Design a protein around this ligand. Sequence first.
Ligand SMILES: [Mn+2]
Ligand SMILES: [Mn+2]
Length: 445
Amino acid sequence: LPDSILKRGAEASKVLEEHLERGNIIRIISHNDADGLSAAGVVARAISSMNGQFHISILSRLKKEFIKKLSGEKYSLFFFCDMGSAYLEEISRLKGDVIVADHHQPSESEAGPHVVHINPHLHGLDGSRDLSASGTAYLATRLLNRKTAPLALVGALGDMQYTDGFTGANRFIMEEAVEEGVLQVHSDLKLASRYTEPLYRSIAYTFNPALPGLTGDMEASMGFLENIGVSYGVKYPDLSPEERDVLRDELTRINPEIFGEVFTSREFRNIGDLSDIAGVLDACGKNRKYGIGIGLCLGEREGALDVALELQKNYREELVKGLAWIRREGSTTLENLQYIYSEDKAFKGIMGTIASISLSLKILDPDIPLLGLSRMDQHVKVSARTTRPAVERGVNLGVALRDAAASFGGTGGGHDIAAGAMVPYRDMESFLQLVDEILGTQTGP
DNA sequence: CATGGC
DNA sequence: CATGGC
Ligand SMILES: [Mn+2]
Ligand SMILES: [Mn+2]
């Protein structure tokens, strides 16, 4: 990684260690996903390795009315993880010392003399491929503690930074943890929750990489194992190399991407590999159980874990319901577009996820872009998703959704492979035709 | 009113 | 997925 980001991380490692000398308690503010949670856990474990104290708040968004609330708190150091860049002037106003470890699209109005931004964008690194908020926090706290490098990668996983290998600083952090002896890389089958589920559920719940026929299908995987010589109820670590060699051979036919890198730290032995941990933190976040999530990053392991594993389990049962619905009621196709639609509240928060899983499983044609639609009374939340072939071929959902949404006083955007929009329900039909007419110009002439 | 989710 | 509107 470029020297500047290790310099700037060291600049922020100074500000911390000197407040911990004085006995100051540190304020941590972070985001509520796996990257946010794992980021907070990083700073918290650096802080506990030096007998410091801290006060964590976990929020979904950062609002101005919270940074104003923050300024009468009388804390000497504010450590923002996975949020800040957007609201830099308002955090510059804040008294005392400040650290923003974020990886979002920063403010060119780049404020703060008391403030220490770390953000991989400002060191010509990629903010959605090469380093995560949890990763950036480890750069901020490398000099104090190096045992936290696993959590750094957990955030990177949850936040989808893995194409054929961790790029950039994540690779660097991955390298570094291996040398430290806290992380182990291995090539193995990438099955969901191996230590903790029987083989057939583990194959059923492997949503990424998708397993056509098997993913989200207990009876089929159960079937699949039975008729290939393998005990559907035994745990994956309890197989023998020749039956391991059989499942590997067959699962590789169904999708070769299932064999590849798997990361394990001795702190998470019994729970999961770093992907499974990410999953668990995401489930805690999505149930507003932030103390359970943080608990886990700090080693807490009794009933908290069992609660956390059950949140994962429940969420996975949603996604099967989920892909089972998709499936019963297919997508209605049109010109350069698919779309599916629900008024069921059960699917409002899951729609994008099942949308893109359903393309990986080939249920719905991966070449045609897919618009998940969820009715929120007078508005319709839109989750757009397509394949890598569909982009390298014109399709850009990032712009198209912004164009068409703003047309009807609504609001959309993103990338590229994946966009979101909020649109009036009265307009939905004309909106769906306008995206279709916009994609047609994006691929045709 | 206030906050806190997506 | 852009939020910052609901
Ligand atoms: Mn993040
Ligand atoms: Mn985040």
